[PDB]
Ligand binder design. Structure first.
Ligand code: HEM
Ligand code: 3DM
Length: 402
């Protein structure tokens, strides 16, 4: 496309570092555009993302580097009967009535445990010391990985993140950085060594862990889902389900710190924490551009005639800055009206764990503000955000008077 020749000079590092300038141009110039370094069409506006995500003429497809990492059948990358089974497999523990039975007793003790390690220090780096540990320890316990330390769960989702978002392609459409998949492969090898004995035990001795239920639920007597059939969805969980609540927490805190009067409002009135988190997810979407759909027949979208079999990346993080929907979207504003957002996706492949994720983030922020009501950002340190596929702050240094 001639007028978009500038996209030929967009680099993967630029998008990782800050994708918002390029995507602001895309939303104005070409809401559906082929980005050469990504090797794919990308949807940048709310209208196009929503249309593709909910269209009967599209189905799910995994991004190329996502497929290289996860294989088949990743719940995010399959359709039809297999997708229906995998959705029925994961949905029981995510049902709102079920989450509300036990989410407080799960997350609140975990939050307190991590807070107790630093709440009297006067200083902390909240990403590593609080947001990521609460996120992974909560989900890890739900899954049945109680004995996998939070440090290891965090390492796994970091390696899986880098492998899944190793998206850069060269002039021939080939992956430009094939060595970048190696740490994904090594994370998977470590996960197998840890989880295979757990699956061995759950097959014979089912318990209340989610993965035991993934093996046994809805199966004939004495049968379990094959472990090779469920492992790719385990990997999906060990990346985004482990990573994203911690990133949503942290981005919400950075946004609130950027509006000090609003941080004070939320500390004074913790019933505003859910609204603060919803704005945080719009403001810096944790899953920024990590899923995709593929056309199943010829379609015209945003003036582009697409053949059947065309993948389209859903850059929801860009859609959530659509100035057709929001005023000054790069500014965090708790008092924005509660409008629809796309941080959880849309359609049949929309996020399955919204209700759980929102509660994890809410409880974690509740306990943090109760423990450290005078929390302040350490302005001597910068906050850098990183990530095009998944985006969040790489650290969050804070201080408080002890
Ligand atoms: C703030 C935290 C989270 C955010 C922002 C988020 C966002 C998303 C997004 C954008 C997608 C892709 C939707 C699409 O392609 O249209 C997704 C998929 C998914 N998420 Fe969430 N997620 C979060 C946490 C979680 C958690 C904690 C779990 C599990 C306990 C979870 C389970 C899933 C599943 C199973 C899918 C795949 C759905 C499917 O393909 O059918 N997510 N999520
Ligand atoms: C590409 O990887 C993912 C995409 C969307 C959601 C995920 O975890 C829930 C995830 O791991």
């Amino acid at each position: 496309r001639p007028d978009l020749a500038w996209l030929d000079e967009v680099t993967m590092t630029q998008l990782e570092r800050n994708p918002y300038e390029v995507y602001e141009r895309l939303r104005a110039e070409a809401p559906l555009a082929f980005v050469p370094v990504l090797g794919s069409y990308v949807a940048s506006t709310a209208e196009v993302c929503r249309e593709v995500a909910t269209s009967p003429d599209f189905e799910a497809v995994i991004t190329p580097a996502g497929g290289r990492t996860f294989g088949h059948p990743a719940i995010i990358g399959v359709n039809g009967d297999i997708h229906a089974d995998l959705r029925s497999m994961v949905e029981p523990a995510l049902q709102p009535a079920e989450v509300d039975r036990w989410i407080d007793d799960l997350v609140r003790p975990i939050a307190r445990r991590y807070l107790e390690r630093f709440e009297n220090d006067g200083h902390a780096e909240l990403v590593a010391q609080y947001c990521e540990p609460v996120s992974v320890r909560s989900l890890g316990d739900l899954l049945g990985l109680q004995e996998v330390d939070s440090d290891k769960l965090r390492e796994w989702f970091a390696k899986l993140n880098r492998s899944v978002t190793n998206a850069a392609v060269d002039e021939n459409g080939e992956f430009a950085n094939p060595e970048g998949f190696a740490e994904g492969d090594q994370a998977k090898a470590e996960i197998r060594a840890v989880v295979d004995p757990l699956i061995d035990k759950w097959i014979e001795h089912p318990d209340d862990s989610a993965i035991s239920h993934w093996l046994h639920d809805g199966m004939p007597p004495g049968q379990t889902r094959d472990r090779e059939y469920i492992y790719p969805t385990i990997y999906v969980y060990l990346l985004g389900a482990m990573q994203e609540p911690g990133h949503g927490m942290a981005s919400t805190l950075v946004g609130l710190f950027s509006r000090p009067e609003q941080l004070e409002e939320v500390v004074d009135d913790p019933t505003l924490i859910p609204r603060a988190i919803a704005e945080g997810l719009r403001w810096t979407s944790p899953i920024w551009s990590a899923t995709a759909r593929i056309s199943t027949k010829p379609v015209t979208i945003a003036g582009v005639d697409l053949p059947a079999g065309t993948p389209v990346m859903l850059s929801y993080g860009s859609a959530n800055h659509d100035t057709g929907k929001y005023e000054a979207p790069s500014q965090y504003d708790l008092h924005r009206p509660p409008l629809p957002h796309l941080a959880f996706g849309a359609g049949n492949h929309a996020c399955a764990g919204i209700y759980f994720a929102n509660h994890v983030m809410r409880i974690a922020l509740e306990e943090l503000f109760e423990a450290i009501p005078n929390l302040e950002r350490d302005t001597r340190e910068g906050v850098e955000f990183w990530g095009w596929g998944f985006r969040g702050p790489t650290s969050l240094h804070v201080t408080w008077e002890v």
